PDB file of all heavy atoms in Angstrom:
ATOM      1  N   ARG A 140    -180.132  37.642-193.628  1.00 51.14           N
ATOM      2  CA  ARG A 140    -180.056  39.100-193.919  1.00 51.14           C
ATOM      3  C   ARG A 140    -178.810  39.425-194.599  1.00 51.14           C
ATOM      4  O   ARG A 140    -177.665  39.136-194.036  1.00 51.14           O
ATOM      5  CB  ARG A 140    -180.679  39.887-192.786  1.00 51.14           C
ATOM      6  CG  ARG A 140    -180.965  41.351-193.079  1.00 51.14           C
ATOM      7  CD  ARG A 140    -182.412  41.595-193.392  1.00 51.14           C
ATOM      8  NE  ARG A 140    -183.177  41.574-192.060  1.00 51.14           N
ATOM      9  CZ  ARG A 140    -183.015  42.309-191.028  1.00 51.14           C
ATOM     10  NH1 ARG A 140    -181.791  42.624-190.708  1.00 51.14           N
ATOM     11  NH2 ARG A 140    -183.961  42.832-190.385  1.00 51.14           N
ATOM     12  N   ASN A 141    -178.827  39.951-195.763  1.00 51.46           N
ATOM     13  CA  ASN A 141    -177.599  40.387-196.512  1.00 51.46           C
ATOM     14  C   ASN A 141    -177.146  41.659-196.093  1.00 51.46           C
ATOM     15  O   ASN A 141    -177.961  42.490-195.545  1.00 51.46           O
ATOM     16  CB  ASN A 141    -177.807  40.239-197.945  1.00 51.46           C
ATOM     17  CG  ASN A 141    -178.208  38.888-198.524  1.00 51.46           C
ATOM     18  OD1 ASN A 141    -179.148  38.633-199.270  1.00 51.46           O
ATOM     19  ND2 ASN A 141    -177.556  37.880-197.876  1.00 51.46           N
ATOM     20  N   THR A 142    -175.837  41.933-196.138  1.00 51.14           N
ATOM     21  CA  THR A 142    -175.314  43.212-195.784  1.00 51.14           C
ATOM     22  C   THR A 142    -175.952  44.458-196.570  1.00 51.14           C
ATOM     23  O   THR A 142    -175.888  45.572-196.064  1.00 51.14           O
ATOM     24  CB  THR A 142    -173.796  43.326-195.965  1.00 51.14           C
ATOM     25  OG1 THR A 142    -173.486  43.205-197.402  1.00 51.14           O
ATOM     26  CG2 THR A 142    -173.158  42.211-195.165  1.00 51.14           C
ATOM     27  N   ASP A 143    -176.598  44.232-197.804  1.00 48.93           N
ATOM     28  CA  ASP A 143    -177.138  45.339-198.480  1.00 48.93           C
ATOM     29  C   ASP A 143    -178.605  45.591-198.067  1.00 48.93           C
ATOM     30  O   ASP A 143    -179.273  46.430-198.623  1.00 48.93           O
ATOM     31  CB  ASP A 143    -177.005  45.019-199.968  1.00 48.93           C
ATOM     32  CG  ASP A 143    -178.045  44.002-200.440  1.00 48.93           C
ATOM     33  OD1 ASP A 143    -178.486  43.239-199.650  1.00 48.93           O
ATOM     34  OD2 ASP A 143    -178.267  44.000-201.674  1.00 48.93           O
ATOM     35  N   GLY A 144    -179.047  44.856-197.136  1.00 50.28           N
ATOM     36  CA  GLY A 144    -180.452  45.053-196.691  1.00 50.28           C
ATOM     37  C   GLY A 144    -181.380  43.994-197.328  1.00 50.28           C
ATOM     38  O   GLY A 144    -182.593  43.896-196.841  1.00 50.28           O
ATOM     39  N   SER A 145    -180.942  43.337-198.394  1.00 52.20           N
ATOM     40  CA  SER A 145    -181.830  42.296-198.995  1.00 52.20           C
ATOM     41  C   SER A 145    -181.853  41.202-198.156  1.00 52.20           C
ATOM     42  O   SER A 145    -181.038  41.056-197.210  1.00 52.20           O
ATOM     43  CB  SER A 145    -181.295  42.000-200.418  1.00 52.20           C
ATOM     44  OG  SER A 145    -180.031  41.325-200.346  1.00 52.20           O
ATOM     45  N   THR A 146    -182.685  40.270-198.369  1.00 53.28           N
ATOM     46  CA  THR A 146    -182.847  38.977-197.504  1.00 53.28           C
ATOM     47  C   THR A 146    -182.980  37.807-198.411  1.00 53.28           C
ATOM     48  O   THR A 146    -183.642  37.808-199.518  1.00 53.28           O
ATOM     49  CB  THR A 146    -184.021  39.116-196.606  1.00 53.28           C
ATOM     50  OG1 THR A 146    -183.759  40.205-195.611  1.00 53.28           O
ATOM     51  CG2 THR A 146    -184.264  37.847-195.854  1.00 53.28           C
ATOM     52  N   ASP A 147    -182.412  36.612-198.035  1.00 51.82           N
ATOM     53  CA  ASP A 147    -182.492  35.435-198.830  1.00 51.82           C
ATOM     54  C   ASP A 147    -183.564  34.544-198.113  1.00 51.82           C
ATOM     55  O   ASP A 147    -183.619  34.433-196.877  1.00 51.82           O
ATOM     56  CB  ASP A 147    -181.155  34.626-198.780  1.00 51.82           C
ATOM     57  CG  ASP A 147    -179.986  35.487-199.296  1.00 51.82           C
ATOM     58  OD1 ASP A 147    -180.226  36.175-200.386  1.00 51.82           O
ATOM     59  OD2 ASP A 147    -178.845  35.405-198.749  1.00 51.82           O
ATOM     60  N   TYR A 148    -184.380  33.937-198.867  1.00 52.45           N
ATOM     61  CA  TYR A 148    -185.488  33.125-198.243  1.00 52.45           C
ATOM     62  C   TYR A 148    -185.573  31.622-198.770  1.00 52.45           C
ATOM     63  O   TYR A 148    -185.363  31.304-199.940  1.00 52.45           O
ATOM     64  CB  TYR A 148    -186.894  33.772-198.526  1.00 52.45           C
ATOM     65  CG  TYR A 148    -187.017  35.160-198.150  1.00 52.45           C
ATOM     66  CD1 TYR A 148    -186.420  36.227-198.751  1.00 52.45           C
ATOM     67  CD2 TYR A 148    -187.823  35.423-196.963  1.00 52.45           C
ATOM     68  CE1 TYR A 148    -186.569  37.527-198.263  1.00 52.45           C
ATOM     69  CE2 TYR A 148    -187.987  36.800-196.480  1.00 52.45           C
ATOM     70  CZ  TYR A 148    -187.431  37.798-197.208  1.00 52.45           C
ATOM     71  OH  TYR A 148    -187.616  39.043-196.847  1.00 52.45           O
ATOM     72  N   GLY A 149    -185.969  30.697-197.884  1.00 53.82           N
ATOM     73  CA  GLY A 149    -186.198  29.348-198.229  1.00 53.82           C
ATOM     74  C   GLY A 149    -185.105  28.353-198.292  1.00 53.82           C
ATOM     75  O   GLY A 149    -183.883  28.624-198.083  1.00 53.82           O
ATOM     76  N   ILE A 150    -185.472  27.223-198.792  1.00 56.58           N
ATOM     77  CA  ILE A 150    -184.559  26.147-199.024  1.00 56.58           C
ATOM     78  C   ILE A 150    -183.315  26.341-199.954  1.00 56.58           C
ATOM     79  O   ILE A 150    -182.275  25.863-199.808  1.00 56.58           O
ATOM     80  CB  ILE A 150    -185.439  24.894-199.530  1.00 56.58           C
ATOM     81  CG1 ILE A 150    -185.218  23.779-198.635  1.00 56.58           C
ATOM     82  CG2 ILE A 150    -185.012  24.570-201.017  1.00 56.58           C
ATOM     83  CD1 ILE A 150    -186.229  22.674-198.677  1.00 56.58           C
ATOM     84  N   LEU A 151    -183.531  27.291-200.914  1.00 57.83           N
ATOM     85  CA  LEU A 151    -182.494  27.609-201.877  1.00 57.83           C
ATOM     86  C   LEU A 151    -182.074  29.106-201.688  1.00 57.83           C
ATOM     87  O   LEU A 151    -181.459  29.669-202.468  1.00 57.83           O
ATOM     88  CB  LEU A 151    -182.915  27.358-203.221  1.00 57.83           C
ATOM     89  CG  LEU A 151    -182.932  25.872-203.743  1.00 57.83           C
ATOM     90  CD1 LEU A 151    -183.576  25.744-205.089  1.00 57.83           C
ATOM     91  CD2 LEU A 151    -181.485  25.340-203.701  1.00 57.83           C
ATOM     92  N   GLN A 152    -182.341  29.684-200.527  1.00 54.54           N
ATOM     93  CA  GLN A 152    -181.991  31.059-200.222  1.00 54.54           C
ATOM     94  C   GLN A 152    -182.330  32.021-201.435  1.00 54.54           C
ATOM     95  O   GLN A 152    -181.136  32.694-201.780  1.00 54.54           O
ATOM     96  CB  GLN A 152    -180.577  31.130-199.589  1.00 54.54           C
ATOM     97  CG  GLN A 152    -180.561  30.338-198.288  1.00 54.54           C
ATOM     98  CD  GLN A 152    -181.252  31.077-197.178  1.00 54.54           C
ATOM     99  OE1 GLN A 152    -180.567  31.858-196.447  1.00 54.54           O
ATOM    100  NE2 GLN A 152    -182.514  30.901-197.030  1.00 54.54           N
ATOM    101  N   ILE A 153    -183.366  32.176-201.845  1.00 52.90           N
ATOM    102  CA  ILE A 153    -183.581  33.200-203.077  1.00 52.90           C
ATOM    103  C   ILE A 153    -183.635  34.568-202.474  1.00 52.90           C
ATOM    104  O   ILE A 153    -184.363  34.911-201.547  1.00 52.90           O
ATOM    105  CB  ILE A 153    -184.886  32.863-203.747  1.00 52.90           C
ATOM    106  CG1 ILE A 153    -184.854  31.397-204.244  1.00 52.90           C
ATOM    107  CG2 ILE A 153    -185.006  33.701-204.963  1.00 52.90           C
ATOM    108  CD1 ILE A 153    -185.566  31.129-205.582  1.00 52.90           C
ATOM    109  N   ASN A 154    -182.808  35.420-203.029  1.00 54.72           N
ATOM    110  CA  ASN A 154    -182.641  36.850-202.614  1.00 54.72           C
ATOM    111  C   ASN A 154    -183.751  37.747-203.064  1.00 54.72           C
ATOM    112  O   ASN A 154    -184.291  37.698-204.157  1.00 54.72           O
ATOM    113  CB  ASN A 154    -181.242  37.443-203.204  1.00 54.72           C
ATOM    114  CG  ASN A 154    -180.862  38.700-202.514  1.00 54.72           C
ATOM    115  OD1 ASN A 154    -180.551  38.680-201.349  1.00 54.72           O
ATOM    116  ND2 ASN A 154    -180.923  39.769-203.373  1.00 54.72           N
ATOM    117  N   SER A 155    -184.135  38.709-202.108  1.00 53.81           N
ATOM    118  CA  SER A 155    -185.103  39.653-202.395  1.00 53.81           C
ATOM    119  C   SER A 155    -184.730  40.819-203.237  1.00 53.81           C
ATOM    120  O   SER A 155    -185.585  41.509-203.781  1.00 53.81           O
ATOM    121  CB  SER A 155    -185.617  40.186-200.995  1.00 53.81           C
ATOM    122  OG  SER A 155    -184.521  40.967-200.441  1.00 53.81           O
ATOM    123  N   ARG A 156    -183.420  41.031-203.420  1.00 53.49           N
ATOM    124  CA  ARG A 156    -183.045  42.154-204.228  1.00 53.49           C
ATOM    125  C   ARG A 156    -183.477  42.022-205.717  1.00 53.49           C
ATOM    126  O   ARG A 156    -183.640  43.040-206.409  1.00 53.49           O
ATOM    127  CB  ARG A 156    -181.440  42.211-204.285  1.00 53.49           C
ATOM    128  CG  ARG A 156    -180.852  43.251-205.131  1.00 53.49           C
ATOM    129  CD  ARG A 156    -181.097  44.663-204.747  1.00 53.49           C
ATOM    130  NE  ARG A 156    -180.849  45.630-205.756  1.00 53.49           N
ATOM    131  CZ  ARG A 156    -179.666  45.792-206.446  1.00 53.49           C
ATOM    132  NH1 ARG A 156    -178.709  45.010-206.080  1.00 53.49           N
ATOM    133  NH2 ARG A 156    -179.505  46.603-207.447  1.00 53.49           N
ATOM    134  N   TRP A 157    -183.761  40.807-206.157  1.00 55.93           N
ATOM    135  CA  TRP A 157    -184.158  40.579-207.557  1.00 55.93           C
ATOM    136  C   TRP A 157    -185.312  39.706-207.784  1.00 55.93           C
ATOM    137  O   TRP A 157    -186.106  39.999-208.651  1.00 55.93           O
ATOM    138  CB  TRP A 157    -182.941  39.995-208.352  1.00 55.93           C
ATOM    139  CG  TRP A 157    -182.066  40.993-209.023  1.00 55.93           C
ATOM    140  CD1 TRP A 157    -182.310  41.883-210.031  1.00 55.93           C
ATOM    141  CD2 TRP A 157    -180.722  41.153-208.650  1.00 55.93           C
ATOM    142  NE1 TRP A 157    -181.263  42.611-210.289  1.00 55.93           N
ATOM    143  CE2 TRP A 157    -180.251  42.235-209.544  1.00 55.93           C
ATOM    144  CE3 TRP A 157    -179.805  40.659-207.672  1.00 55.93           C
ATOM    145  CZ2 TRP A 157    -178.893  42.763-209.295  1.00 55.93           C
ATOM    146  CZ3 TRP A 157    -178.539  41.028-207.563  1.00 55.93           C
ATOM    147  CH2 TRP A 157    -178.122  42.126-208.373  1.00 55.93           C
ATOM    148  N   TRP A 158    -185.478  38.649-206.962  1.00 61.84           N
ATOM    149  CA  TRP A 158    -186.445  37.688-207.212  1.00 61.84           C
ATOM    150  C   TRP A 158    -187.940  37.681-206.474  1.00 61.84           C
ATOM    151  O   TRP A 158    -188.829  37.171-207.127  1.00 61.84           O
ATOM    152  CB  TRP A 158    -185.878  36.333-206.989  1.00 61.84           C
ATOM    153  CG  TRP A 158    -184.563  36.193-207.771  1.00 61.84           C
ATOM    154  CD1 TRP A 158    -183.385  36.198-207.270  1.00 61.84           C
ATOM    155  CD2 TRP A 158    -184.322  36.059-209.206  1.00 61.84           C
ATOM    156  NE1 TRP A 158    -182.344  36.219-208.199  1.00 61.84           N
ATOM    157  CE2 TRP A 158    -182.953  36.137-209.420  1.00 61.84           C
ATOM    158  CE3 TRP A 158    -185.255  36.029-210.223  1.00 61.84           C
ATOM    159  CZ2 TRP A 158    -182.446  36.079-210.720  1.00 61.84           C
ATOM    160  CZ3 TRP A 158    -184.631  35.993-211.574  1.00 61.84           C
ATOM    161  CH2 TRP A 158    -183.320  36.007-211.719  1.00 61.84           C
ATOM    162  N   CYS A 159    -188.005  38.258-205.390  1.00 60.56           N
ATOM    163  CA  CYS A 159    -189.257  38.283-204.595  1.00 60.56           C
ATOM    164  C   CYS A 159    -189.497  39.545-203.819  1.00 60.56           C
ATOM    165  O   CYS A 159    -188.538  40.182-203.419  1.00 60.56           O
ATOM    166  CB  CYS A 159    -189.338  37.094-203.685  1.00 60.56           C
ATOM    167  SG  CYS A 159    -188.115  37.226-202.440  1.00 60.56           S
ATOM    168  N   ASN A 160    -190.700  39.910-203.606  1.00 60.19           N
ATOM    169  CA  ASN A 160    -190.976  41.088-202.872  1.00 60.19           C
ATOM    170  C   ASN A 160    -191.187  40.908-201.390  1.00 60.19           C
ATOM    171  O   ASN A 160    -192.070  40.184-200.980  1.00 60.19           O
ATOM    172  CB  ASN A 160    -192.119  41.890-203.448  1.00 60.19           C
ATOM    173  CG  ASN A 160    -192.661  42.968-202.573  1.00 60.19           C
ATOM    174  OD1 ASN A 160    -191.832  43.913-202.059  1.00 60.19           O
ATOM    175  ND2 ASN A 160    -193.888  42.904-202.138  1.00 60.19           N
ATOM    176  N   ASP A 161    -190.497  41.608-200.550  1.00 61.43           N
ATOM    177  CA  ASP A 161    -190.648  41.527-199.027  1.00 61.43           C
ATOM    178  C   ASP A 161    -190.897  42.913-198.461  1.00 61.43           C
ATOM    179  O   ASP A 161    -190.825  43.128-197.378  1.00 61.43           O
ATOM    180  CB  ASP A 161    -189.395  40.900-198.380  1.00 61.43           C
ATOM    181  CG  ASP A 161    -188.147  41.684-198.565  1.00 61.43           C
ATOM    182  OD1 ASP A 161    -188.332  42.896-199.231  1.00 61.43           O
ATOM    183  OD2 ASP A 161    -187.082  41.307-198.168  1.00 61.43           O
ATOM    184  N   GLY A 162    -191.179  43.910-199.327  1.00 61.79           N
ATOM    185  CA  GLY A 162    -191.438  45.185-198.955  1.00 61.79           C
ATOM    186  C   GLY A 162    -190.419  45.992-198.118  1.00 61.79           C
ATOM    187  O   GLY A 162    -190.656  47.047-197.667  1.00 61.79           O
ATOM    188  N   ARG A 163    -189.260  45.425-197.928  1.00 60.72           N
ATOM    189  CA  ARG A 163    -188.235  45.985-197.189  1.00 60.72           C
ATOM    190  C   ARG A 163    -186.785  46.009-197.792  1.00 60.72           C
ATOM    191  O   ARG A 163    -185.757  46.098-197.165  1.00 60.72           O
ATOM    192  CB  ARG A 163    -188.115  45.485-195.815  1.00 60.72           C
ATOM    193  CG  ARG A 163    -187.945  44.022-195.708  1.00 60.72           C
ATOM    194  CD  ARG A 163    -187.256  43.567-194.351  1.00 60.72           C
ATOM    195  NE  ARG A 163    -185.854  43.645-194.464  1.00 60.72           N
ATOM    196  CZ  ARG A 163    -185.140  44.594-193.796  1.00 60.72           C
ATOM    197  NH1 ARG A 163    -185.647  45.363-192.937  1.00 60.72           N
ATOM    198  NH2 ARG A 163    -183.889  44.767-194.193  1.00 60.72           N
ATOM    199  N   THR A 164    -186.758  45.823-199.224  1.00 62.48           N
ATOM    200  CA  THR A 164    -185.570  45.846-199.805  1.00 62.48           C
ATOM    201  C   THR A 164    -185.652  46.989-200.932  1.00 62.48           C
ATOM    202  O   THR A 164    -185.987  46.814-202.073  1.00 62.48           O
ATOM    203  CB  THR A 164    -185.244  44.482-200.622  1.00 62.48           C
ATOM    204  OG1 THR A 164    -185.183  43.388-199.798  1.00 62.48           O
ATOM    205  CG2 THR A 164    -183.920  44.610-201.382  1.00 62.48           C
ATOM    206  N   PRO A 165    -185.435  48.244-200.481  1.00 61.26           N
ATOM    207  CA  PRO A 165    -185.546  49.457-201.272  1.00 61.26           C
ATOM    208  C   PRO A 165    -184.828  49.306-202.621  1.00 61.26           C
ATOM    209  O   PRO A 165    -183.656  48.954-202.708  1.00 61.26           O
ATOM    210  CB  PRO A 165    -184.948  50.538-200.397  1.00 61.26           C
ATOM    211  CG  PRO A 165    -185.299  50.054-199.072  1.00 61.26           C
ATOM    212  CD  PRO A 165    -184.916  48.641-199.078  1.00 61.26           C
ATOM    213  N   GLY A 166    -185.578  49.698-203.621  1.00 60.79           N
ATOM    214  CA  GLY A 166    -184.955  49.595-205.074  1.00 60.79           C
ATOM    215  C   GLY A 166    -184.657  48.287-205.623  1.00 60.79           C
ATOM    216  O   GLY A 166    -183.714  48.183-206.403  1.00 60.79           O
ATOM    217  N   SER A 167    -185.507  47.300-205.274  1.00 62.63           N
ATOM    218  CA  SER A 167    -185.233  45.900-205.722  1.00 62.63           C
ATOM    219  C   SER A 167    -186.314  45.502-206.732  1.00 62.63           C
ATOM    220  O   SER A 167    -187.281  46.262-206.986  1.00 62.63           O
ATOM    221  CB  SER A 167    -185.218  44.921-204.581  1.00 62.63           C
ATOM    222  OG  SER A 167    -186.532  44.738-204.059  1.00 62.63           O
ATOM    223  N   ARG A 168    -186.140  44.325-207.352  1.00 62.84           N
ATOM    224  CA  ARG A 168    -187.091  43.769-208.354  1.00 62.84           C
ATOM    225  C   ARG A 168    -187.797  42.571-207.705  1.00 62.84           C
ATOM    226  O   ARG A 168    -187.391  42.129-206.662  1.00 62.84           O
ATOM    227  CB  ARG A 168    -186.398  43.385-209.588  1.00 62.84           C
ATOM    228  CG  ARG A 168    -185.755  44.461-210.511  1.00 62.84           C
ATOM    229  CD  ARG A 168    -184.514  45.102-209.954  1.00 62.84           C
ATOM    230  NE  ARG A 168    -183.839  45.844-210.851  1.00 62.84           N
ATOM    231  CZ  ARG A 168    -182.721  46.626-210.586  1.00 62.84           C
ATOM    232  NH1 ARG A 168    -182.245  46.679-209.304  1.00 62.84           N
ATOM    233  NH2 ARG A 168    -182.058  47.312-211.613  1.00 62.84           N
ATOM    234  N   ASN A 169    -188.879  42.117-208.417  1.00 65.42           N
ATOM    235  CA  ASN A 169    -189.610  40.979-207.980  1.00 65.42           C
ATOM    236  C   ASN A 169    -189.819  40.063-209.229  1.00 65.42           C
ATOM    237  O   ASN A 169    -190.911  39.678-209.631  1.00 65.42           O
ATOM    238  CB  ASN A 169    -190.979  41.394-207.473  1.00 65.42           C
ATOM    239  CG  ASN A 169    -191.831  40.259-207.026  1.00 65.42           C
ATOM    240  OD1 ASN A 169    -192.963  40.477-206.678  1.00 65.42           O
ATOM    241  ND2 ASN A 169    -191.305  39.010-207.228  1.00 65.42           N
ATOM    242  N   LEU A 170    -188.684  39.726-209.877  1.00 63.14           N
ATOM    243  CA  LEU A 170    -188.702  38.907-211.062  1.00 63.14           C
ATOM    244  C   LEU A 170    -189.511  37.545-211.079  1.00 63.14           C
ATOM    245  O   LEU A 170    -189.889  37.139-212.085  1.00 63.14           O
ATOM    246  CB  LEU A 170    -187.196  38.623-211.566  1.00 63.14           C
ATOM    247  CG  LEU A 170    -186.454  39.775-211.959  1.00 63.14           C
ATOM    248  CD1 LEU A 170    -185.058  39.390-212.543  1.00 63.14           C
ATOM    249  CD2 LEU A 170    -187.216  40.459-213.128  1.00 63.14           C
ATOM    250  N   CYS A 171    -189.684  37.017-209.865  1.00 62.28           N
ATOM    251  CA  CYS A 171    -190.488  35.761-209.771  1.00 62.28           C
ATOM    252  C   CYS A 171    -191.979  36.012-209.471  1.00 62.28           C
ATOM    253  O   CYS A 171    -192.774  35.117-209.411  1.00 62.28           O
ATOM    254  CB  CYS A 171    -189.874  34.877-208.698  1.00 62.28           C
ATOM    255  SG  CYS A 171    -188.384  34.025-209.219  1.00 62.28           S
ATOM    256  N   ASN A 172    -192.303  37.323-209.382  1.00 64.07           N
ATOM    257  CA  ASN A 172    -193.655  37.744-209.059  1.00 64.07           C
ATOM    258  C   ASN A 172    -194.354  37.022-207.854  1.00 64.07           C
ATOM    259  O   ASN A 172    -195.494  36.465-208.048  1.00 64.07           O
ATOM    260  CB  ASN A 172    -194.549  37.617-210.349  1.00 64.07           C
ATOM    261  CG  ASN A 172    -194.290  38.726-211.285  1.00 64.07           C
ATOM    262  OD1 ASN A 172    -194.305  39.971-210.872  1.00 64.07           O
ATOM    263  ND2 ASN A 172    -194.262  38.367-212.616  1.00 64.07           N
ATOM    264  N   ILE A 173    -193.715  36.956-206.684  1.00 66.81           N
ATOM    265  CA  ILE A 173    -194.267  36.388-205.572  1.00 66.81           C
ATOM    266  C   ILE A 173    -193.913  36.949-204.197  1.00 66.81           C
ATOM    267  O   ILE A 173    -192.775  37.626-204.157  1.00 66.81           O
ATOM    268  CB  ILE A 173    -193.974  34.861-205.479  1.00 66.81           C
ATOM    269  CG1 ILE A 173    -192.411  34.628-205.585  1.00 66.81           C
ATOM    270  CG2 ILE A 173    -194.584  34.080-206.647  1.00 66.81           C
ATOM    271  CD1 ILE A 173    -191.937  33.400-204.909  1.00 66.81           C
ATOM    272  N   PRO A 174    -194.588  36.882-203.173  1.00 66.53           N
ATOM    273  CA  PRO A 174    -194.212  37.413-201.880  1.00 66.53           C
ATOM    274  C   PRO A 174    -192.977  36.500-201.519  1.00 66.53           C
ATOM    275  O   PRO A 174    -193.014  35.297-201.587  1.00 66.53           O
ATOM    276  CB  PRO A 174    -195.433  37.094-200.987  1.00 66.53           C
ATOM    277  CG  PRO A 174    -196.646  37.182-201.964  1.00 66.53           C
ATOM    278  CD  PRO A 174    -196.052  36.322-203.083  1.00 66.53           C
TER     279      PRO A 174
END
């Protein structure tokens, strides 16, 4: 869990702020189009 509320996931810790949707990172993107 990052200090800004975003979260990093998986083997390469991809952040939710820009790359994936986790429904709990207000005002973020989902550039990789995946949960």
Side-chain angles (χ1 to χ4, degrees):
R140 189 101 74 55
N141 299 140
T142 64
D143 76 337
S145 68
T146 296
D147 303 318
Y148 303 74
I150 236 157
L151 286 171
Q152 296 287 268
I153 304 216
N154 193 70
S155 64
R156 175 70 195 302
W157 274 292
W158 313 104
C159 62
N160 168 56
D161 64 2
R163 55 155 276 107
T164 302
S167 72
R168 290 72 164 177
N169 178 186
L170 292 184
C171 284
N172 282 315
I173 58 153

